[PDB]
Amino acid sequence: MDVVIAVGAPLTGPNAAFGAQIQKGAEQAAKDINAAGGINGEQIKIVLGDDVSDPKQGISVANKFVADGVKFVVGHFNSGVSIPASEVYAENGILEITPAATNPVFTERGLWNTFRTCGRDDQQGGIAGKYLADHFKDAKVAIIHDKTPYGQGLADETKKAANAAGVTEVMYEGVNVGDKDFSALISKMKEAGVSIIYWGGLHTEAGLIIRQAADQGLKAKLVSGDGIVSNELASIAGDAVEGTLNTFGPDPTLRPENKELVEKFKAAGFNPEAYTLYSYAAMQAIAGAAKAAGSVEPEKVAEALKKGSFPTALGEISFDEKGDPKLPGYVMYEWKKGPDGKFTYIQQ
Ligand SMILES: CC(C)[C@H](N)C(=O)O
Ligand SMILES: [Ca+2]
Ligand SMILES: [Ca+2]
Numbered sequence: 001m002d003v004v005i006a007v008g009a010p011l012t013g014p015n016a017a018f019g020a021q022i023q024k025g026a027e028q029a030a031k032d033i034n035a036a037g038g039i040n041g042e043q044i045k046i047v048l049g050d051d052v053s054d055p056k057q058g059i060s061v062a063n064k065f066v067a068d069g070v071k072f073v074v075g076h077f078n079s080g081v082s083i084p085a086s087e088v089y090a091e092n093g094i095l096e097i098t099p100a101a102t103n104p105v106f107t108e109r110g111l112w113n114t115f116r117t118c119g120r121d122d123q124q125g126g127i128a129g130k131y132l133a134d135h136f137k138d139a140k141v142a143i144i145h146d147k148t149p150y151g152q153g154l155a156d157e158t159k160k161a162a163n164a165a166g167v168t169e170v171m172y173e174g175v176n177v178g179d180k181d182f183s184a185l186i187s188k189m190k191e192a193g194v195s196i197i198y199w200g201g202l203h204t205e206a207g208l209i210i211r212q213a214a215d216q217g218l219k220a221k222l223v224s225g226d227g228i229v230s231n232e233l234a235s236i237a238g239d240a241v242e243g244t245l246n247t248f249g250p251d252p253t254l255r256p257e258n259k260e261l262v263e264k265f266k267a268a269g270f271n272p273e274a275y276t277l278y279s280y281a282a283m284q285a286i287a288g289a290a291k292a293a294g295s296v297e298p299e300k301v302a303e304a305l306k307k308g309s310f311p312t313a314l315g316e317i318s319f320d321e322k323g324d325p326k327l328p329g330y331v332m333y334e335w336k337k338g339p340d341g342k343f344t345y346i347q348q
Helices: 016-035 055-068 079-091 123-135 148-167 183-192 205-215 233-237 258-267 276-293 299-308
Strands: 003-009 045-052 073-077 093-098 114-116 139-144 169-173 196-200 219-226 247-249 309-310 317-320 333-336 341-347
Touching: 003 016, 003 055, 016 045, 016 073, 016 258, 016 276, 016 317, 045 055, 045 093, 055 205, 073 079, 073 258, 073 276, 079 093, 079 148, 093 276, 093 299, 093 317, 123 196, 123 333, 139 148, 139 183, 139 219, 148 196, 169 183, 169 258, 196 205, 205 233, 247 317, 258 276, 276 299, 276 309, 309 341
Parallel strands: 003 045, 003 073, 073 093, 093 114, 139 169, 139 196, 196 219, 219 247
Antiparallel strands: 247 333, 309 317, 333 341
16 A cells, blocks of 8 residues: 655754644655655655644654554754653564654664654764863853753753863753743843853753843853754844854754745745755655665664765764664754844854
Protein backbone atom coordinates (compact mmCIF):
# COMPACT_ATOMS: atom_id res chain seq x y z
CA MET A 1 0.00 0.00 0.00
CA ASP A 2 0.93 3.63 0.47
CA VAL A 3 3.79 4.36 2.85
CA VAL A 4 2.18 5.91 5.94
CA ILE A 5 4.33 8.66 7.39
CA ALA A 6 3.30 10.69 10.46
CA VAL A 7 4.21 14.21 11.53
CA GLY A 8 4.47 14.39 15.29
CA ALA A 9 4.82 18.00 16.33
CA PRO A 10 3.49 20.91 18.40
CA LEU A 11 0.78 21.97 15.94
CA THR A 12 -0.77 24.09 18.68
CA GLY A 13 0.49 25.78 21.82
CA PRO A 14 3.43 28.16 22.36
CA ASN A 15 5.43 26.31 19.73
CA ALA A 16 2.80 26.18 16.96
CA ALA A 17 4.98 28.16 14.52
CA PHE A 18 7.70 25.50 14.88
CA GLY A 19 5.04 22.81 14.52
CA ALA A 20 4.04 24.49 11.26
CA GLN A 21 7.67 24.58 10.02
CA ILE A 22 7.78 20.79 10.48
CA GLN A 23 4.37 20.06 9.03
CA LYS A 24 4.83 22.25 5.93
CA GLY A 25 8.33 20.93 5.29
CA ALA A 26 7.15 17.32 5.62
CA GLU A 27 4.03 17.84 3.48
CA GLN A 28 5.99 19.51 0.70
CA ALA A 29 8.52 16.67 0.59
CA ALA A 30 5.83 14.03 0.41
CA LYS A 31 4.17 16.04 -2.35
CA ASP A 32 7.46 16.28 -4.29
CA ILE A 33 8.54 12.64 -3.75
CA ASN A 34 5.07 11.33 -4.71
CA ALA A 35 4.94 13.26 -7.97
CA ALA A 36 8.32 11.63 -8.59
CA GLY A 37 6.95 8.11 -8.21
CA GLY A 38 6.83 7.80 -4.44
CA ILE A 39 8.96 5.53 -2.30
CA ASN A 40 9.89 2.34 -4.15
CA GLY A 41 6.80 2.68 -6.36
CA GLU A 42 4.49 3.57 -3.45
CA GLN A 43 2.68 6.83 -2.55
CA ILE A 44 3.27 8.52 0.79
CA LYS A 45 0.27 9.14 3.01
CA ILE A 46 0.81 11.87 5.64
CA VAL A 47 -0.98 11.73 8.99
CA LEU A 48 -0.73 14.48 11.61
CA GLY A 49 -0.48 14.27 15.39
CA ASP A 50 -0.36 17.33 17.67
CA ASP A 51 1.72 16.80 20.86
CA VAL A 52 1.14 20.34 22.17
CA SER A 53 4.76 20.22 23.44
CA ASP A 54 3.54 17.94 26.22
CA PRO A 55 5.15 14.54 26.90
CA LYS A 56 1.90 12.85 28.05
CA GLN A 57 0.08 14.20 25.03
CA GLY A 58 2.99 13.02 22.86
CA ILE A 59 2.69 9.49 24.23
CA SER A 60 -1.03 9.47 23.35
CA VAL A 61 -0.13 10.73 19.88
CA ALA A 62 2.48 7.99 19.45
CA ASN A 63 0.07 5.25 20.44
CA LYS A 64 -2.42 6.61 17.92
CA PHE A 65 0.15 6.51 15.12
CA VAL A 66 0.94 2.89 16.04
CA ALA A 67 -2.78 2.15 15.72
CA ASP A 68 -3.24 3.93 12.38
CA GLY A 69 -0.50 1.80 10.85
CA VAL A 70 2.08 4.54 10.78
CA LYS A 71 5.49 3.29 9.75
CA PHE A 72 7.65 6.42 9.91
CA VAL A 73 7.42 9.52 12.09
CA VAL A 74 9.06 12.84 11.27
CA GLY A 75 9.23 14.46 14.71
CA HIS A 76 8.98 15.34 17.30
CA PHE A 77 10.11 18.91 18.04
CA ASN A 78 10.77 18.90 21.81
CA SER A 79 13.36 16.54 23.27
CA GLY A 80 11.10 15.82 26.25
CA VAL A 81 8.36 14.66 23.88
CA SER A 82 10.64 12.81 21.43
CA ILE A 83 12.51 10.72 24.02
CA PRO A 84 9.43 8.96 25.52
CA ALA A 85 7.53 8.77 22.20
CA SER A 86 10.54 7.05 20.63
CA GLU A 87 10.19 4.14 23.09
CA VAL A 88 6.64 3.65 21.97
CA TYR A 89 7.88 3.70 18.37
CA ALA A 90 10.86 1.43 19.05
CA GLU A 91 8.51 -1.22 20.45
CA ASN A 92 5.96 -1.06 17.66
CA GLY A 93 8.22 -1.10 14.59
CA ILE A 94 8.21 2.60 13.74
CA LEU A 95 11.28 4.57 12.57
CA GLU A 96 11.46 8.09 14.08
CA ILE A 97 13.53 10.84 12.52
CA THR A 98 13.45 14.18 14.34
CA PRO A 99 14.11 17.45 12.48
CA ALA A 100 14.62 19.33 15.74
CA ALA A 101 15.11 17.39 19.01
CA THR A 102 18.71 18.05 20.02
CA ASN A 103 19.10 16.40 23.43
CA PRO A 104 21.90 13.74 23.34
CA VAL A 105 19.75 11.18 25.23
CA PHE A 106 17.53 10.79 22.17
CA THR A 107 20.19 8.81 20.30
CA GLU A 108 22.22 7.54 23.27
CA ARG A 109 19.85 4.75 24.39
CA GLY A 110 20.82 2.14 21.79
CA LEU A 111 17.41 2.23 20.09
CA TRP A 112 17.26 0.90 16.51
CA ASN A 113 14.78 3.51 15.36
CA THR A 114 16.10 6.93 16.43
CA PHE A 115 17.58 9.34 13.87
CA ARG A 116 17.90 13.12 13.41
CA THR A 117 18.50 15.69 10.70
CA CYS A 118 19.59 18.18 13.36
CA GLY A 119 22.58 18.42 15.70
CA ARG A 120 22.90 17.51 19.36
CA ASP A 121 23.50 19.61 22.44
CA ASP A 122 26.95 18.42 23.42
CA GLN A 123 27.90 19.91 20.02
CA GLN A 124 25.78 23.02 20.54
CA GLY A 125 26.91 23.69 24.12
CA GLY A 126 30.47 23.10 23.00
CA ILE A 127 30.14 25.96 20.53
CA ALA A 128 28.32 28.31 22.93
CA GLY A 129 30.49 27.60 25.97
CA LYS A 130 33.55 28.35 23.88
CA TYR A 131 32.01 31.47 22.35
CA LEU A 132 31.30 32.78 25.87
CA ALA A 133 35.01 32.28 26.51
CA ASP A 134 36.12 33.78 23.21
CA HIS A 135 34.07 36.98 23.62
CA PHE A 136 32.77 37.49 27.18
CA LYS A 137 35.91 36.37 29.02
CA ASP A 138 35.32 38.60 32.07
CA ALA A 139 31.55 38.99 31.92
CA LYS A 140 29.23 38.12 34.75
CA VAL A 141 27.28 35.29 33.11
CA ALA A 142 23.98 33.97 34.34
CA ILE A 143 22.87 30.54 33.12
CA ILE A 144 19.09 30.22 33.10
CA HIS A 145 17.09 27.24 31.84
CA ASP A 146 13.44 26.16 31.47
CA LYS A 147 13.74 22.95 33.53
CA THR A 148 13.02 20.77 30.49
CA PRO A 149 15.16 17.92 29.27
CA TYR A 150 16.17 20.13 26.34
CA GLY A 151 16.53 23.41 28.13
CA GLN A 152 18.42 22.22 31.18
CA GLY A 153 20.43 19.82 28.97
CA LEU A 154 21.73 22.56 26.69
CA ALA A 155 22.37 24.93 29.62
CA ASP A 156 24.38 22.13 31.26
CA GLU A 157 26.40 21.37 28.10
CA THR A 158 27.04 25.09 27.77
CA LYS A 159 28.01 25.46 31.45
CA LYS A 160 30.25 22.41 31.22
CA ALA A 161 32.09 23.81 28.21
CA ALA A 162 32.30 27.34 29.59
CA ASN A 163 33.37 26.31 33.12
CA ALA A 164 36.13 24.31 31.42
CA ALA A 165 37.38 27.06 29.10
CA GLY A 166 37.65 29.42 32.10
CA VAL A 167 34.21 31.01 32.36
CA THR A 168 32.42 30.60 35.67
CA GLU A 169 28.75 31.62 35.72
CA VAL A 170 27.62 33.77 38.65
CA MET A 171 24.14 32.29 38.71
CA TYR A 172 22.49 29.05 37.57
CA GLU A 173 18.71 29.08 37.84
CA GLY A 174 15.71 27.29 36.40
CA VAL A 175 12.35 28.78 35.49
CA ASN A 176 9.12 27.05 34.59
CA VAL A 177 7.65 26.89 31.08
CA GLY A 178 4.57 29.13 31.04
CA ASP A 179 5.94 31.48 33.72
CA LYS A 180 5.28 35.09 32.68
CA ASP A 181 6.92 37.18 35.43
CA PHE A 182 10.71 37.13 35.70
CA SER A 183 11.07 40.27 37.84
CA ALA A 184 12.52 38.41 40.83
CA LEU A 185 15.11 36.61 38.73
CA ILE A 186 15.84 39.83 36.87
CA SER A 187 16.19 41.70 40.18
CA LYS A 188 18.53 38.92 41.27
CA MET A 189 20.58 39.20 38.07
CA LYS A 190 20.98 42.98 38.50
CA GLU A 191 22.44 42.58 41.99
CA ALA A 192 24.82 40.00 40.56
CA GLY A 193 26.16 42.40 37.92
CA VAL A 194 25.01 40.11 35.11
CA SER A 195 25.96 41.33 31.62
CA ILE A 196 25.29 38.05 29.76
CA ILE A 197 22.21 35.84 30.13
CA TYR A 198 22.58 32.36 28.67
CA TRP A 199 19.16 30.81 28.11
CA GLY A 200 18.67 27.08 27.57
CA GLY A 201 15.02 27.04 26.44
CA LEU A 202 12.51 28.23 23.81
CA HIS A 203 11.52 31.56 22.30
CA THR A 204 8.42 32.37 24.39
CA GLU A 205 10.25 32.56 27.72
CA ALA A 206 13.32 34.01 26.00
CA GLY A 207 11.35 36.93 24.55
CA LEU A 208 9.73 37.73 27.90
CA ILE A 209 13.13 37.73 29.64
CA ILE A 210 14.53 40.08 27.00
CA ARG A 211 11.48 42.37 27.25
CA GLN A 212 11.32 42.58 31.03
CA ALA A 213 15.13 42.76 31.39
CA ALA A 214 15.22 45.95 29.29
CA ASP A 215 12.26 47.41 31.19
CA GLN A 216 14.01 46.85 34.55
CA GLY A 217 17.24 48.40 33.29
CA LEU A 218 19.26 45.19 33.34
CA LYS A 219 21.74 45.84 30.59
CA ALA A 220 22.52 42.26 29.63
CA LYS A 221 22.76 40.42 26.32
CA LEU A 222 20.82 37.15 25.92
CA VAL A 223 22.70 34.26 24.25
CA SER A 224 20.72 31.13 23.49
CA GLY A 225 20.38 28.25 21.08
CA ASP A 226 18.20 26.67 18.44
CA GLY A 227 14.96 27.06 20.42
CA ILE A 228 14.73 30.81 19.78
CA VAL A 229 14.89 30.71 15.98
CA SER A 230 11.36 31.73 15.16
CA ASN A 231 10.27 35.10 13.86
CA GLU A 232 7.81 35.49 16.74
CA LEU A 233 10.67 36.34 19.11
CA ALA A 234 10.88 39.87 17.71
CA SER A 235 7.19 40.43 18.64
CA ILE A 236 7.35 38.85 22.08
CA ALA A 237 10.66 40.54 22.92
CA GLY A 238 10.18 43.88 21.18
CA ASP A 239 13.03 46.09 19.93
CA ALA A 240 15.12 44.92 22.89
CA VAL A 241 15.69 41.75 20.81
CA GLU A 242 18.45 43.62 18.97
CA GLY A 243 21.88 42.12 19.67
CA THR A 244 20.56 38.83 21.04
CA LEU A 245 22.82 35.89 20.04
CA ASN A 246 22.02 32.26 19.34
CA THR A 247 23.50 29.11 17.89
CA PHE A 248 21.89 27.11 15.07
CA GLY A 249 22.96 25.19 11.96
CA PRO A 250 23.82 27.20 8.81
CA ASP A 251 20.52 28.58 7.46
CA PRO A 252 19.40 26.00 4.85
CA THR A 253 17.28 28.60 3.12
CA LEU A 254 20.50 30.36 2.20
CA ARG A 255 21.80 27.32 0.34
CA PRO A 256 22.00 28.22 -3.38
CA GLU A 257 20.82 24.66 -4.21
CA ASN A 258 17.57 25.33 -2.33
CA LYS A 259 16.77 28.53 -4.21
CA GLU A 260 13.92 27.08 -6.29
CA LEU A 261 12.50 25.10 -3.36
CA VAL A 262 12.52 28.14 -1.09
CA GLU A 263 10.79 30.17 -3.80
CA LYS A 264 8.11 27.49 -4.13
CA PHE A 265 7.28 27.60 -0.41
CA LYS A 266 7.15 31.39 -0.59
CA ALA A 267 4.84 31.32 -3.61
CA ALA A 268 2.55 29.20 -1.46
CA GLY A 269 2.62 31.90 1.18
CA PHE A 270 4.81 30.08 3.69
CA ASN A 271 8.23 31.31 4.80
CA PRO A 272 10.19 28.06 5.06
CA GLU A 273 12.50 29.29 7.81
CA ALA A 274 14.49 27.35 10.38
CA TYR A 275 13.29 23.76 10.80
CA THR A 276 11.12 23.68 7.65
CA LEU A 277 13.90 22.26 5.48
CA TYR A 278 15.27 20.05 8.26
CA SER A 279 11.88 18.37 8.16
CA TYR A 280 11.78 18.29 4.34
CA ALA A 281 15.16 16.57 4.53
CA ALA A 282 13.99 14.01 7.10
CA MET A 283 11.51 12.93 4.44
CA GLN A 284 14.15 12.95 1.70
CA ALA A 285 16.34 10.67 3.84
CA ILE A 286 13.62 8.07 4.43
CA ALA A 287 12.98 7.94 0.70
CA GLY A 288 16.70 7.79 -0.13
CA ALA A 289 17.36 5.01 2.41
CA ALA A 290 14.34 2.94 1.37
CA LYS A 291 15.56 3.01 -2.21
CA ALA A 292 19.09 2.06 -1.19
CA ALA A 293 17.54 -0.70 0.94
CA GLY A 294 15.08 -1.95 -1.67
CA SER A 295 12.50 -2.01 1.14
CA VAL A 296 9.96 0.14 3.05
CA GLU A 297 10.19 -1.97 6.22
CA PRO A 298 11.29 0.48 8.95
CA GLU A 299 13.96 -1.80 10.46
CA LYS A 300 15.56 -2.21 7.03
CA VAL A 301 15.39 1.48 6.11
CA ALA A 302 17.04 2.23 9.46
CA GLU A 303 19.95 -0.06 8.57
CA ALA A 304 20.10 1.71 5.19
CA LEU A 305 20.36 5.18 6.77
CA LYS A 306 23.32 4.08 8.93
CA LYS A 307 25.10 2.65 5.89
CA GLY A 308 24.19 4.98 3.01
CA SER A 309 24.41 8.66 2.13
CA PHE A 310 21.68 10.78 0.60
CA PRO A 311 21.11 14.11 -1.18
CA THR A 312 18.89 16.43 0.85
CA ALA A 313 17.84 20.05 1.20
CA LEU A 314 20.52 20.18 3.93
CA GLY A 315 23.25 18.72 1.72
CA GLU A 316 24.70 15.22 1.46
CA ILE A 317 23.44 13.49 4.58
CA SER A 318 24.91 10.43 6.28
CA PHE A 319 24.33 8.95 9.75
CA ASP A 320 26.56 7.39 12.39
CA GLU A 321 25.83 4.18 14.29
CA LYS A 322 23.51 5.97 16.75
CA GLY A 323 21.45 7.69 14.09
CA ASP A 324 23.09 11.13 14.32
CA PRO A 325 23.66 13.05 11.07
CA LYS A 326 27.10 14.04 9.79
CA LEU A 327 26.49 17.68 8.76
CA PRO A 328 27.97 21.20 9.15
CA GLY A 329 28.12 22.21 12.81
CA TYR A 330 26.52 24.96 14.87
CA VAL A 331 27.32 28.62 14.11
CA MET A 332 26.46 31.82 15.96
CA TYR A 333 23.69 34.19 14.86
CA GLU A 334 22.95 37.76 15.87
CA TRP A 335 19.58 39.46 15.81
CA LYS A 336 19.66 42.59 13.64
CA LYS A 337 17.38 44.61 11.39
CA GLY A 338 16.81 43.09 7.97
CA PRO A 339 16.03 44.90 4.68
CA ASP A 340 12.35 45.11 5.67
CA GLY A 341 13.50 46.80 8.87
CA LYS A 342 12.40 44.12 11.31
CA PHE A 343 14.73 42.11 13.54
CA THR A 344 15.77 38.62 12.49
CA TYR A 345 18.64 36.21 12.97
CA ILE A 346 21.69 36.44 10.73
CA GLN A 347 24.83 34.35 10.89
CA GLN A 348 27.86 36.29 12.08
C1 LIG B 1 12.42 21.90 20.83
C2 LIG B 1 13.76 22.19 20.18
C3 LIG B 1 13.90 23.66 19.92
C4 LIG B 1 14.94 21.69 21.06
N1 LIG B 1 16.12 21.42 20.23
C5 LIG B 1 14.56 20.43 21.81
O1 LIG B 1 15.25 19.42 21.64
O2 LIG B 1 13.57 20.35 22.56
CA1 LIG C 1 12.29 19.18 26.15
CA1 LIG D 1 27.60 5.97 8.48
